[PDB]
Each structure stands twice: as structure tokens, then as C-alpha cells.
């Protein structure tokens, strides 16, 4: 077994093992992980 | 070149931003754009202006336009007042002092609102970014922020300290402690966004975008964990249109509490709150008619909830204006009568009063007293002229025509008129002539004070532009019909002489100074330029892609520039017809384009509110000027060319006048401090038998074990390789220390773990060596603690995968 | 869904008054119910510091109990995560430790797909067991230094 993406659509399970559900997350938080990913999708 | 600057700024009275009153028959602040204005209701003058400084025009002063004031705050006990920008600056302004005393910036957007705290040391203030922001007059800092809500703040409500609350665009009241900068109760007061919040002792009320107004009881001593404010019941108010802003005014002989809802539409609410004896009094004649109908008293009770908003409170009265009530604040509270002032968004302030005997009041409807219009236009001037005299300004507005002189920057007189698209001033300044949308030409007299003549079918279609001859003999008038028609004056009125035929709209008519020549601009992007003395058809202009707005014709007239929404303005030489260069002044359409006289440099205003001063010649900006939040309708230069006069949507016309540490230490420089610190506080405890570190506000045991954290493990075994052993004794102390508390090992328990072990690695040596008993006895202490936390997640660990093993294995048996 | 909303946002503000107040076994099940990984993460995290000065805490550990299967599959799905995690996975030992102790071991397993869930717990519970001893048989360098220095 190895972690993977989130089941669930409005949650964020990254590889570290945490899982991150959007309604909880700080609008601060949120920006910088949709940065966050804009940073991994630019290289690939 | 000389540069321009702006003189002075005139003709808002009332600006985009709240009311405040004083009371002295009572004095009120408006906005006036950047500017801050007093007035005086019943005098109707202007006490005073109150300008921030950096006058427009100037190098120092900023491009882009100065930001608009959105609120207005004046504090009775102190006597001073804060004022809330479009940008999000809030600056100190005192009365007296007529400066800015403080200036902050704490919000990155306008100003919902802003409430000086009764004390006067601090200020409460709620921004369009959902920030609301606490400072501190005395220390001129913001104490903290509050982000929970989702947008913008439509007000908030502190009388005590201990307690807010916050209405927000989003829907959400919330109640906020501002002792532990947090909220602890939420709640939805509407689906739709929460304009107006209004607290009155228990009593809270809240408007909705739809008409449902909410009524809400609070009780701060709950203590319940819910329901601090709980909704008793809901009542609609007439005005499907939202309520913007609530007050409450309470009459201190009755103790009656009054409250009104401020609509967007021009109708205002005003409510008023029953006494106790009344309600339990009209609460008994109910039960009565339902025993009489025969209801159940379980239905009984049903029918007592459903109308418990209207027991708690009676409607009053209605406020209807003839234009729509930008704000309104309570002015006057008395048993007779009150007295509430409203500013509209038409430039007007009206102070309204209403007497009431008893429950309802004794006026069929309100009246105002007195109405401030002297100053103001109802509607945007739409096009402005300047006399030869250049001493008086005609601005033309819908159902208004004024004439301003530029010393007293007021009206002399004031004309009655239509809807006017074209103003122009006859020679001498005597007459005024102005063509309306329906077609019908006014002239007015400005002696006479009255019109002289109408002819309403001179005309058909609208008069989109009007010029004259220098002599004013002649009159040429473009408009709709697609034919311009020449006016002769005989002595005064006005007889048509000839029409001519166009296959387009005249959209404006310029004549040449010499009168030589006359132009043309045509919604098919087509400018014809004929003879006036012979009416042939000379030269044309094409290539705009849109029609050409203005024409303008040198005094040298062998130039002719034509601005057109296609945003570029275009210089066009008049001898042959060829373009010499095309600008891109300005981003929108550049409504008006003028010649400085006795000048190739040209003046251009457009829709985004820009001045620009523009030479020919060179074909580059000289310099730009803003000082309209709104787009700038029409421009005006004065026969000197010394100033130039420029209108604008927001209802203000302004004169333009010619003038590291690198890893190692920081575990070294760490240690020392934690150390020392925890060293001194056994040798107080011994006795009894930092500075830095109270800003850290952590342990020492804290502090360091964060700064092991901190550093990355792939330099530290280099990092604890370069310790030298004196502080590694301080090392072996700092864990020991660690050890007595078992949280704290627990919870980084395999990092402290690794680097013990590694230290005593390097220096096994000379730990030997040491002959210090004492230390010895905090090594096993050390190892023995540390031992029972490592086989406390070792058995852990161990009885788990014995137990999911088993539960695997029962699983395979039942279905194998 | 406006009483939905209506409801999930004072389960929102009761769960941040708790968290701040240090109730975590009321947090504990509002964080189950409204699903936050780091609302959940951290109730469980402090509650075990403050039981380090039977598993977590009696109220704490009767609220475990009372899950019926549903949450139960989403706690252990995420202790299956944090299990992963070497920095976190002492916190999923804990917590499904005190699910062995406060269910029915039969019940459990015919739960639909928690064998699956439970086959991902072995190896990286396995992998910890491996750690952590080296750590104690490492750790045996303090009697080396004692005994050195008894000489």
C-alpha cells in the first residue's frame, strides 16, 4: 500500500501521508497549496 | 512648457460616503470626494473645507486619482474625526485643528465603517476585505485583526469591551470576544448578504437583502455555549428593495425607542418599538378574540408566536424622497416631534422632520424644513462652455442649467431646462443656448434670468452638438436627423436660414476661428469638412473606427484634431487632408479634445477620467493630470488659455489653472541561553531550600529543543560533530531536563534519541574520563527514563500487529 | 439545504470552541462527524500529550467505543495514512490500539473492506516494530558509559 490521491473530490491527500479537507483549510493555506501545485504541474 | 495645476475644486456637496450630524439648527459633515466638507443645514452655506493637502496638478502629487472618501466618523468627546478612503487609509482629522492628526493603514480596501470607541483611545474598523482592525489612538497601531469573516463587513456593534458583534456580506453574524481575539458563536441571520445591523440593549435587528427584517434576543450571561443571540421572530418590511444601514433613536421623556431602515429605493422605514404595558395589554385582547373564534389555546399559542414580531414592535411612518437616499441619520429626538437628515445621491442634503402625539404621527407625512441644492447639480453636467469674459462657467445638466463665476466658484443664476447635450455661450457672455435630446433649442438670457425664445420644432431629432461664429451671427446645429441646419440672429431671435442634407448624424459641429471653414463628424467615421462662406464640399478624414466625438481647428487653422471612441486620437493636417501622426491617448473613448488658444498643444479628456496635455509638435504627453473618480464629460478652455474647466459624472467641476548564522552556533548560541537560564532557576530554587526568552515566549527547554528542530538533520550530525564537549556537558544537562517531563519526550522522543547517541559516540572518550558523580547520576536518570518511554511504543508497536494479525487470520478461515 | 448549512456551520463553531477550550473528546466526535483530517489529527495528537503527563483518556476513550462502523472505517483509514508516516504513525498506534480494546473483534472484521485497510496497517506497523527496538538495543551505550565510568 502506498499513499495516493484523496478519495474524496474537495479533499487533498498529499504523499506525506496527511490528508487535507478544503472546508477546514485557511484561505491563506488554500492559496499557497493552489500555488503549491501550479509549481509542480509547470515543470511536468 | 508652464505646468497646470488645479486651483480649487467645486459643485459636490455631497459626495458617496455616510452623513454625520452635530448638533449646535444642526451642522453636518459630507464627503466631498478626497475633499471633506461642512455644512450648515439651515444657513446653507459652507463653514468650512477640509483638504488633505497635495493640491492635483502637482510633480509631488500621485498619478492615479486620489481615493474617495467612503466614511465619516466625528466623535462628540473628543471632537474629532476619522476618515475612511476608497484605498483603505484611515486618517485623523481634527475639527478644530482642520489637519490630519494620525494616519493608518491597516485595510487594502475602502472602508465599510469605522466607530471611535466611548473612551476615544482606540477605533473600531470594519473594511470591505473582511478585515476588521482595533487601533489604538494613543499608540497609533493596530492591537489585532479579525479575518474569520468570509467578505465584506456591513457593520459591527461594540458597547463593551468584553464583547462584538459582526454582520458581514456573507450572511453570518458573529459574536467575537476581543479579550481572546476569537469568535465563539456563529450564526446565519439571512441567506442573502446582512446589510444593516442595529443593537438597541437586548434587541437586535437585522435587514436582509429581502425585505424580512429578523429580530434578535441576546443574553451575553448565557453561558450555554449556544445561543448567546437567538431569533424571536421575523417581520417584513413594505420595502421589497434592501435595507442599506439601521439606526435606533430612544426619547428620553418616554424612553419610547424609535428605529428607521434605510432602503436603497427612496422610500425609507421608520419603526417604532412598543412599551411593555401596551404589549401585555395588546397581547390580552388577542387571547380574547381567539376565545371568541374558538381556537385551541395550543392554536392559541401558535397564533401568539407567529405574531410575536408584532407585538414587540409598531410601525411608525415612511420616508419618501424624489431621489433615492445614498444615507440618513437620526438628528432631533423629542416627545413632540423628530427630526431625521438624509443625503441623496443627487448632490442634495434634505433635513426632514416629523411631528408624532402617542402611537402615530400627527403629520399625514414627513416634511423637510430645509433642502441644500444651491451648490448642486441634480443631474451630471453634460457639457460646459466658458464666457470671452472667461469670469462666469455655464455647466448644462439635465432639468438644470447653471452659471458659475470662478471667484465665487457658486451659482448667480439658475435656468430651467431639458435635457441638454450641447451648451454654448453667445459673445459678450450675455445669452446662454443649449440644444435638448428632444430637439427643442433653449436660449436662455443670463440678465433677464428666464428664457427669451423656444422653438420646439426647430428641430426634430435631438441636438447632439451646437456651434457659432465668432461672430455669433451665424449659428450651424448637428443632430440626429442627419441635416445641419444655419441660424441668423435678428434682432433677439433666432430664424432658420437653410438646411443641408447628410447621409449621417451630425454627432458635432466645429467652425473654424477665421470661419473659413466648417467640420463635420459622421457615425460613418467620416469627417467632411465644408466652406461656411460657400457650403462645398473641401476634404474628408477616414480611417477612425469609430465616429469621431470632437473636432477641434487651430487658430493657425491648418490643423484640425479629431478624438473618436476608437481611443486614438488623431492629428489631420487641413491643407490636404493627410494624418501627420496618430496618438493612442488614452485607454477609453476620449470624449472631448480641445486647442489650447493661440496654441498647436491640445487638451484631451476621456472616459477614464484622465486630463492629459498634449503638444502636437512633438507628438508626446507634456503631463497627465488626475484628479476625477469619474469620467470627465466635457472640457472647457478660457480664451487666455490660462485655465481650463473640467466636468465630471461625480458631479465635481475642477479648474485646471496654468502655473546568517551559520548551523552550529545556533544549537551552541541556543544551548548557552536555555542553560544558563534553567541553571539560575534551580540555583533560585537551591536558594529557597531572559529578556530575549519572555519574547520567545517558550521554555528553555522549548526554545532549543525548536532550534534542534530548525536545524536539517543532514548538517547535524556535523552540527553535534563540532560541539566541543564544555557544551556538551550542557547538551547532556538540557536532555536530563527534558526527561523530567514526559509530554515533551514523547513527543520528539526519536529525534532527542539520535542525538544523545551520537554525541556520546564522539567523545566516548573523554565522558569517561569525567570524574563528576553528579553527572553520572544524570545519565542514569537518563537511561532509565528514556527506557520506559522507548518500551512504551515498543509494546505498543508489538501487541497491534499481533492483534491485526489475528484479526486477518479469523477473517481467511471464514472465508476460505 | 439551508437547514444543512444552517447546522454544519454551528458544528463548525462548536468544534473550534472545543478545540480551544480542550475538549477534545466533544471535538473528537465533531471532528469525526464534519470529517477534518487535522481537526481529528490534532485532537488526538494533544490529547495524548496531556495523557503522557487507559489509552488516551476514559471520556475520550467511551466516545471510541460508541462509533458504530461507518466512522470507524474513516478513522482507520486515516490511521492507515498516518501509519505510513513515521513522524505520525505513534499517533495511529494509539488510536487503533484503542479500538482492539473497546470493540468486538469478531464485529470488526466482518465490516466490509477493513481487511483491506487492515493489510495496509502490517507492513509499516512491522517496519516500526523493526524501528524503535534498534533504538533500544542502541540505547544500551548508557550502561557502556556507566560501567566505563564505575572503573
Redesign the interface.
Known amino acids: ?3 495516493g490521491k484523496a478519495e ?1 473530490d474537495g ?1 487533498i ?1 498529499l504523499k ?6 478544503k ?2 483549510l485557511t ?1 491563506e493555506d488554500k492559496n499557497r497549496l493552489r500555488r503549491a501545485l501550479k509549481r509542480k504541474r509547470s515543470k511536468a | 512648457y508652464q505646468r497646470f495645476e488645479q486651483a480649487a475644486a467645486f459643485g459636490v456637496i455631497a459626495s458617496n460616503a455616510n452623513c454625520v450630524w452635530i448638533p449646535a439648527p444642526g451642522q453636518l459633515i459630507t464627503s466631498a470626494l478626497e475633499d471633506v466638507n461642512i455644512w450648515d443645514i439651515k444657513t446653507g452655506d459652507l463653514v468650512s473645507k477640509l483638504s488633505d493637502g497635495l493640491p492635483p496638478g502637482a510633480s509631488d502629487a500621485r498619478g492615479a486619482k486620489p481615493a474617495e472618501c467612503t466614511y465619516l466618523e466625528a466623535h462628540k468627546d473628543t471632537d474629532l474625526l476619522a476618515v475612511g478612503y476608497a484605498d483603505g487609509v484611515i486618517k485623523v482629522w481634527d475639527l478644530m485643528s482642520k489637519t490630519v492628526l494620525l494616519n493608518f493603514n491597516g485595510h487594502k480596501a475602502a472602508i465599510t465603517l469605522l466607530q471611535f470607541d466611548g473612551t476615544g483611545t482606540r477605533l473600531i474598523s470594519g473594511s470591505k476585505d473582511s478585515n476588521i482592525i482595533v487601533w489604538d489612538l494613543v499608540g497609533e497601531v493596530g492591537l489585532y485583526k479579525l479575518r474569520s469573516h468570509k467578505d465584506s463587513i456591513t457593520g459591527f456593534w461594540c458597547q463593551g469591551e468584553d464583547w462584538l458583534i459582526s454582520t458581514s456580506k456573507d450572511g453570518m453574524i458573529k459574536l467575537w470576544d476581543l479579550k481572546t481575539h476569537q469568535c465563539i458563536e456563529t450564526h446565519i441571520a439571512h441567506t442573502g448578504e446582512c446589510w444593516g445591523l442595529a443593537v438597541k440593549d437586548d434587541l437586535l435587528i437585522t435587514t436582509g437583502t429581502d425585505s424580512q427584517v429578523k429580530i434578535w434576543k441576546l443574553d451575553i450571561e448565557n453561558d450555554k455555549m449556544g445561543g448567546k443571540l437567538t431569533e424571536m421572530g421575523i417581520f417584513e418590511k413594505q420595502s421589497k428593495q434592501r435595507g442599506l444601514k439601521i439606526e435606533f433613536i430612544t426619547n428620553s421623556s418616554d424612553k419610547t425607542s424609535f428605529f428607521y431602515i434605510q432602503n436603497a429605493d427612496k422610500t425609507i422605514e421608520t419603526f417604532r418599538i412598543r412599551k411593555e404595558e401596551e404589549i401585555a395589554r395588546g397581547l390580552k385582547k388577542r387571547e380574547k378574540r381567539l376565545k371568541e373564534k374558538g381556537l385551541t389555546e395550543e392554536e392559541i399559542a401558535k397564533s401568539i408566536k407567529e405574531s410575536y414580531s408584532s407585538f414587540i414592535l409598531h410601525p411608525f411612518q415612511t420616508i419618501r424622497s424624489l431621489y433615492k437616499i445614498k444615507s440618513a441619520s437620526w438628528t432631533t429626538v423629542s416627545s413632540s416631534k423628530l427630526e431625521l437628515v438624509l443625503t441623496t445621491s443627487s448632490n442634495t442634503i434634505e433635513y426632514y422632520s416629523i411631528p408624532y402625539e402617542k402611537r402615530d404621527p400627527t403629520s399625514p407625512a414627513p416634511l423637510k424644513t430645509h433642502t441644500i441644492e444651491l451648490q448642486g447639480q441634480r443631474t451630471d453636467v453634460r457639457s460646459i462652455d466658458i464666457s470671452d469674459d472667461n469670469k462666469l462657467l455655464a455647466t448644462a445638466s439635465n432639468g438644470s442649467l447653471k452659471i458659475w463665476n470662478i471667484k465665487t466658484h457658486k451659482c448667480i443664476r439658475t435656468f430651467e431646462c431639458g435635457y441638454a447635450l450641447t451648451c454654448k455661450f453667445l459673445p459678450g457672455g450675455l445669452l446662454v443656448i443649449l440644444g435638448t435630446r428632444n430637439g427643442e433649442l433653449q436660449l436662455f438670457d443670463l440678465a433677464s434670468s428666464s428664457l427669451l425664445d423656444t422653438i420646439e420644432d426647430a428641430h426634430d431629432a435631438a441636438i447632439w452638438s451646437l456651434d457659432l461664429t465668432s461672430d455669433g451671427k451665424r449659428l450651424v446645429t448637428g443632430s440626429a436627423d442627419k441635416t445641419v441646419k444655419f441660424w441668423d440672429f435678428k434682432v433677439l431671435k433666432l430664424h432658420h436660414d437653410t438646411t443641408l442634407e447628410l447621409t449621417d448624424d451630425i454627432l458635432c459641429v466645429r467652425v473654424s476661428p477665421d470661419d473659413r471653414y466648417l467640420a463635420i463628424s459622421l457615425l460613418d467615421n467620416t469627417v467632411k469638412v465644408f466652406f461656411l462662406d460657400s457650403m462645398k464640399f473641401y476634404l474628408s478624414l477616414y480611417g477612425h473606427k469609430l465616429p469621431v466625438l470632437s473636432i477641434d481647428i487651430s487658430f493657425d487653422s491648418k490643423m484640425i484634431i479629431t478624438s473618436s471612441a476608437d481611443k486614438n486620437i488623431k492629428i489631420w493636417g487641413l491643407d490636404f487632408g493627410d494624418c501627420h501622426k496618430s496618438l493612442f491617448a488614452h485607454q477609453d473613448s476620449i470624449m472631448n479634445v480641445k486647442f489650447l488658444p493661440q496654441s498647436h498643444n491640445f487638451f484631451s479628456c476621456s472616459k477614464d477620467a484622465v486630463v492629459k496635455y498634449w503638444d502636437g509638435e512633438k507628438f508626446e504627453c507634456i503631463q497627465k493630470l488626475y484628479a476625477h473618480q469619474s469620467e470627465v464629460w466635457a472640457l472647457a478652455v478660457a480664451t487666455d488659455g490660462g485655465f481650463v474647466v473640467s466636468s465630471s459624472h461625480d458631479h465635481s467641476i475642477r479648474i485646471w489653472e496654468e502655473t546568517s548564522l551559520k548551523a552550529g552556533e545556533r544549537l551552541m548560541e541556543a544551548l548557552d541561553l536555555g542553560i544558563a537560564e534553567i541553571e539560575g532557576l534551580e540555583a533560585y530554587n537551591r536558594d529557597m531550600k531572559n529578556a530575549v526568552l519572555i519574547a520567545v515566549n517558550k521554555t528553555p527547554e522549548q526554545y532549543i529543543m525548536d532550534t534542534l528542530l530548525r536545524i536539517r538533520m543532514s548538517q547535524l550530525e556535523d552540527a553535534l560533530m563540532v560541539m566541543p564537549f564544555s557544551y556538551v556537558l550542557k547538551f547532556l544537562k538540557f536532555i536530563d531536563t527534558v526527561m523530567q517531563n514526559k509530554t515533551l519526550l514523547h513527543s520528539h522522543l526519536p529525534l532527542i534519541c539520535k542525538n544523545l547517541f551520537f554525541i556520546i559516540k564522539f567523545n566516548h572518550k573523554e565522558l569517561v574520563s569525567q570524574k563528576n558523580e553528579e553527572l553520572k547520576l544524570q545519565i542514569n536518570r537518563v537511561k532509565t527514563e528514556l527506557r520506559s518511554a522507548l518500551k512504551s511504543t515498543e509494546d505498543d508497536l508489538g501487541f497491534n500487529v499481533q492483534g491485526l494479525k489475528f484479526v486477518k487470520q479469523q477473517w481467511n478461515l471464514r472465508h476460505n | 439545504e439551508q437547514e444543512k448549512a444552517k447546522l454544519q456551520v454551528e458544528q463548525e463553531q462548536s468544534l473550534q470552541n472545543y478545540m480551544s477550550k480542550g475538549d477534545w473528546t466533544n471535538a473528537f466526535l465533531l471532528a469525526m462527524t464534519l470529517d477534518h483530517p487535522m481537526r481529528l489529527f490534532n485532537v488526538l495528537k494533544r490529547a495524548l500529550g496531556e495523557s503522557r503527563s487507559v489509552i488516551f483518556n476514559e471520556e475520550l476513550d467511551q466516545a471510541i467505543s460508541i462509533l458504530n462502523d461507518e466512522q470507524l472505517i474513516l478513522l482507520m483509514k486515516r490511521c492507515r495514512d498516518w501509519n505510513t508516516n513515521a513522524k505520525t504513525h505513534t499517533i495511529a498506534q494509539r488510536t487503533i490500539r484503542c479500538i482492539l480494546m473497546h470493540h468486538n473483534i469478531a464485529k470488526l472484521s466482518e465490516i466490509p473492506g477493513m481487511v483491506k485497510i487492515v493489510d495496509a496497517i502490517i507492513p509499516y506497523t512491522q517496519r516500526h516494530f523493526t524501528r524503535v527496538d534498534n533504538l533500544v538495543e542502541q540505547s544500551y551505550i548508557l550502561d557502556y558509559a556507566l560501567v566505563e565510568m564505575d572503573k
Do not use: D, F
Open positions: 500500500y502506498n499513499v474524496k479533499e491527500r506525506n501521508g496527511v490528508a487535507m479537507s472546508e477546514e484561505r
